Nucleic acid binder design. Structure first.
Ligand SMILES: C=C1[C@H](COP(=O)(O)OP(=O)(O)OP(=O)(O)O)[C@@H](O)C[C@@H]1n1cnc2c(=O)nc(N)[nH]c21
Ligand SMILES: [Mg+2]
Lengths: 553, 406
DNA sequence: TCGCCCCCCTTCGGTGCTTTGCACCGAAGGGGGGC
């Protein structure tokens, strides 16, 4: 049926008109698929025939539905969508099974012909003009316009969701103890009533939907576990992800690896310890989706580890609001982090991973903080609260960090958990100069016009050095000057630079970097025993800096 | 009542800002508040054919344990027409900062009695989220002058003046300055008798429909220099790099005498005796740092900017300026919550205190340059916000080259 | 040969700095998943 609900008024963008795009050829199996849908759609009032006075058109096609025999009619409204007004989408996110509470009785329902049950704004219908080709050459196609929401229009999802929300609102207010997860036209309905009382409320809900023109066919009415919902299987005490089939290839293309990595990210929500760094590395610097990419040895190893994880059965549990949320993080190496969220030990609600490289230079403490923030945001979305954290970082390490680092930083209530490898600071800079340590006055300069530069130093003990540099920058030569002081100095060293830039990077105590040169400096800082690093303004002729500035010229 | 026709600025469209995730108790507070506002007609439920949105959240002050809805209309305010071009702006009184006690009152509810231009209401849309996305977001728009919109104090201007006139008449030495939804009420009265007059003003406004600040006690903290008996090569490099920086702010600052004390390639820990000339040069520079800078004046036509540096042990320095190195004010904020161990809470409260001082002194908040990662700030800052206004801010990563302001 | 939503990983290009490259960040490409 067509809902008697009021239509939502919609407009074209100012100054714009409607689409005028011709229909492409289609197979006879799809033409009769469309003629069957459209003849029946016109009978039910979903579409109406139009004539030449309507100058618009848009192409139509059809794909098959997951229910194998049914076809789904689609219209390539890309031209109309560009000229249609913007909407504020009310779908803010995706419900997760870990956010569900245990319920005595559960039902899953789906609305039949959902979009076609919602009427379209009368003044807007003329812009949805289309045509069914019918063996293209034999005759000109028959023209229609939509009277209901078309599949492929930019506004259809939001206008449907808004209508579904209005239709459900009376039932929600009358039954606050009945949880209705509403995703598009899919309805999860859980309650703590006995199965007979529960089925009574479902009948009531289904009858309410039908009065507003939303059918609920028995074929999509799930009554007993396991319920298929949002790509998961809902059991009474647990939930599983629907089976994940990884691509299996002798020769891999760029697009194959993209699919594989996406599958693994999806799996990482419940499969602990998934890693995709080495597989994703293969995508860098590639130029075509069909380009054959050979798996590196590290990528084969990572893939094998993921396959072993995926062959073991896993399940998540449901949320108990009377207990604490606990999030535990482990370090995996190369900027990769995995986490588990649970309430009782060894019964995960869900898992996940964090592996984004943010910034050119960072350290494990920063990235652990980012993982904490991703988990905090995810927990607010799913459960409406922040979990308690168990983190592989000593309280001393963290306390060292947020007192030396110049930016405000914080982690909520957290408990140290000894799961090596631990997160640590890989070096620290002395707050005072080091007695008996050599004093290096460093400096580097590059000629911007050319590619050339020099890096060198002078020391309190009389040591001096200059290294010519090619294809460099002003900022690279200064890092090079520091690079050389660390190279030629003992385990304790005092260094004085005039590069605020270089001082800025090193003072943040990075342990990894997209830069090969900064990585070398990091490796040298880690080997040192004590390092004091100081700054002076350039070209003001101060002590050792003037003489090293003299030297590099 | 007749509405005032309101427009956006030419060539500007309304805000389209996403709603961020909210905790369970903030969502429930907003649902309760918006349901009540909807019955009373202050807001109306809307659909998605309205393409605008503004984030909403909720705060709860510790000395008022009821939730307060907070709509972040900063984007809508930047796009709204100016009322200084349509002659409806508020003058800042110079005497508010002269008072010994300033109490902040939330008078936002007074706006809900004046309807809003029917054609402007679509720009005020907001969306309440849902725990675990059980439902789509629920959208509302305003039918009356919204709290937090800069057009509300301008449109309500004539009304609020008629409401306050009897009180300001009876208490001529009390100064009241309206900033957005707040009244800043200052006096030189004894503190227990200041609160008594605040209660009288509270009662007088209810006839229609915070904690005490002390500008008396806000002090400037200038650039200080270390004092020692003996000085190293490192101390004089730290000293000269600092004065060299400060010569961008102050006039006639010299580093030749001290600078030369450092000739040759010397060890950092070597002790160098101060020559009498250099000692004179030092105490010379210490005096210029002591008394304030000549030729720096507030310009009301330019924005205010605030920089903040984390110094450690709960200390936070800050500078307010409009043009670089011409600081209208330098200060130091000190935490006192009791625990000592939350940087983000301290920075958020430092932002509220600095912005509060700018309202009292100049009548508006500065654009902040926050020494924090954007994602660290956005993960936590709403947990500590207590003001009905929100200032503009941006995020900077600036290592301390010199411990300048400490 | 379509639509709307969330996620991750890679790439690209605009912004502003007392710069001449660099770091930051939002947007868009690819992928996963939902209806
Ligand atoms: C969520 C949606 C509604 C309910 O999705 P649905 O899968 O339950 O389909 P519907 O109720 O119509 O038929 P049903 O009677 O068999 O249940 C459908 O109307 C439309 C929409 N949707 C779904 N998939 C697609 C798609 O790929 N392309 C487009 N443009 N829109 C799509
Ligand atoms: Mg359906």
């Amino acid at each position: 049926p067509i809902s008697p609900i009021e239509t939502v008024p919609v407009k074209l963008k100012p100054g714009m008109d409607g689409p005028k795009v011709k229909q492409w050829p289609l197979t006879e199996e799809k033409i009769k698929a469309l003629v069957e849908i459209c003849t029946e759609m016109e009978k039910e009032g979903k579409i109406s025939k139009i004539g030449p006075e309507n100058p618009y058109n848009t192409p139509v096609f059809a794909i098959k539905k997951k229910d194998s025999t049914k076809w789904r009619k689609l219209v390539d409204f890309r031209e109309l969508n560009k000229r249609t007004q913007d909407f504020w989408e009310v779908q803010l996110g995706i419900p997760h099974p870990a956010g569900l509470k245990q319920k005595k009785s559960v039902t899953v329902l789906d609305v039949g012909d959902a979009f076609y049950s919602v009427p379209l704004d009368k003044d807007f219908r003329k812009y949805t003009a289309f045509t069914i080709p019918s063996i293209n050459n034999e005759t000109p196609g028959i023209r229609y316009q939509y009277n209901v929401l078309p599949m492929g229009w930019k506004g259809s999802p939001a206008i449907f969701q808004s209508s579904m929300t209005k239709i459900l609102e009376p039932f929600r207010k009358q039954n606050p103890d009945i949880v209705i997860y509403q995703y598009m036209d899919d309805l999860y309905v859980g309650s703590d009533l006995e199965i007979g009382q529960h089925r009574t409320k479902i009948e009531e809900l289904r009858q309410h939907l039908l009065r507003w023109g939303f059918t609920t066919p028995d074929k999509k009415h799930q009554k007993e576990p396991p319920f298929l919902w949002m790509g998961y299987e809902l059991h009474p005490d647990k939930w599983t992800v629907q089976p994940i089939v990884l691509p299996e290839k002798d020769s891999w293309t760029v697009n194959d690896i993209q699919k594989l990595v996406g599958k693994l990210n999806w799996a990482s929500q419940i499969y602990a310890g998934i890693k995709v760094r080495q597989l994703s590395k293969l995508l860098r610097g590639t130029k075509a989706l069909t380009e054959v990419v050979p798996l590196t040895e590290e990528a084969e190893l990572e893939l094998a580890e993921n396959r072993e994880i995926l062959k073991e059965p896993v399940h998540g549990v449901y949320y108990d609001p009377s207990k604490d949320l606990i999030a535990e993080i482990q370090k995996q190496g190369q900027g990769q982090w995995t986490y588990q969220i649970y309430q009782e030990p060894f019964k995960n609600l869900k898992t996940g991973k964090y592996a984004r490289m943010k910034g050119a230079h960072t350290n494990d403490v920063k990235q652990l903080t980012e993982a904490v923030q991703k988990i905090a945001t995810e927990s607010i979305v799913i459960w409406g609260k922040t979990p308690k954290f168990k983190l592989p970082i000593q309280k001393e390490t963290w306390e060292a960090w947020w007192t030396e680092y110049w930016q405000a930083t914080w982690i909520p209530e957290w408990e140290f958990v000894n799961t090596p490898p631990l997160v640590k600071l890989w070096y620290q800079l002395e707050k005072e100069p080091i007695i008996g340590a050599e004093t290096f006055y460093v400096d580097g300069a590059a000629n911007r016009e050319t590619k050339l530069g020099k890096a060198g130093y002078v020391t309190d003990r009389g040591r001096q050095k200059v290294v010519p540099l090619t294809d460099t920058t002003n900022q690279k030569t200064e890092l090079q000057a520091i690079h050389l002081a660390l190279q030629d100095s003992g385990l304790e060293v005092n260094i004085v630079t005039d590069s605020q830039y270089a001082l800025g990077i090193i003072q943040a105590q990075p342990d990894k970097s997209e830069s090969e040169l900064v990585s070398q400096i990091i490796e040298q800082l880690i080997k040192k025993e004590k390092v004091y690093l100081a700054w002076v303004p350039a070209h003001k002729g101060i002590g050792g800096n003037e003489q090293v500035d003299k030297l590099v010229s | 009542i007749e509405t005032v026709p309101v427009k956006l600025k030419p060539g500007m469209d309304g805000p389209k800002v996403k709603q961020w995730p909210l905790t369970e108790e903030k969502i429930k507070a907003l649902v309760e508040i918006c349901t009540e506002m909807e019955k009373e007609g202050k807001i109306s439920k809307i659909g998605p054919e309205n393409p605008y949105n503004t984030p909403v959240f909720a705060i709860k002050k510790k000395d008022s344990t009821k939730w307060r809805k907070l709509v972040d209309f900063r984007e809508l305010n930047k796009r709204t027409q100016d009322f200084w071009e349509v002659q409806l702006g508020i003058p800042h009184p110079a005497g508010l900062k002269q008072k010994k006690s300033v109490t902040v009152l939330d008078v936002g509810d007074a706006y809900f009695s004046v309807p809003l231009d029917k054609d402007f209401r679509k720009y005020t849309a907001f969306t309440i989220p849902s725990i675990n996305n059980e439902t789509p977001g629920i959208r509302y728009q305003y039918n009356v002058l919204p709290q937090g919109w800069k057009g509300s104090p301008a449109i309500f201007q004539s009304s609020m003046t008629k409401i306050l006139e009897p009180f300001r008449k009876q208490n001529p030495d009390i100064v009241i300055y309206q900033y957005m939804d707040d009244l800043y009420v200052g006096s030189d009265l004894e503190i227990g008798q200041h609160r008594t007059k605040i209660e009288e003003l509270r009662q007088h406004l209810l006839r229609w429909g915070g904690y005490e600040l002390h500008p008396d006690k806000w002090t400037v903290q200038p650039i200080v220099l270390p004092e020692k008996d003996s000085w190293t090569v490192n101390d004089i490099q730290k000293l000269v790099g600092k004065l060299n920086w400060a010569s961008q702010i102050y006039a006639g600052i010299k580093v030749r005498q001290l600078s030369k004390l450092l000739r040759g390639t010397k060890a950092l820990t070597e002790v160098v005796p101060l020559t009498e000339e250099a000692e004179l040069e030092l105490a010379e520079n210490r005096e210029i740092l002591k008394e304030p800078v000549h030729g720096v004046y507030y310009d009301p036509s330019k924005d205010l900017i605030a920089e903040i540096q984390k110094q450690g042990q709960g200390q936070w320095t800050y500078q307010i300026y409009q043009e670089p190195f011409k600081n209208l004010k330098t200060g130091k904020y000190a935490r006192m919550k009791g625990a000592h161990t939350n940087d983000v809470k301290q920075l958020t409260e430092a932002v509220q205190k600095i912005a509060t001082e700018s309202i009292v002194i100049w009548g508006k908040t500065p654009k902040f340059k926050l020494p924090i990662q954007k994602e660290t700030w956005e993960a936590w800052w709403t947990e500590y916000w207590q003001a009905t206004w929100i200032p503009e801010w941006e995020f900077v990563n600036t290592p301390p080259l010199v411990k300048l302001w400490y």
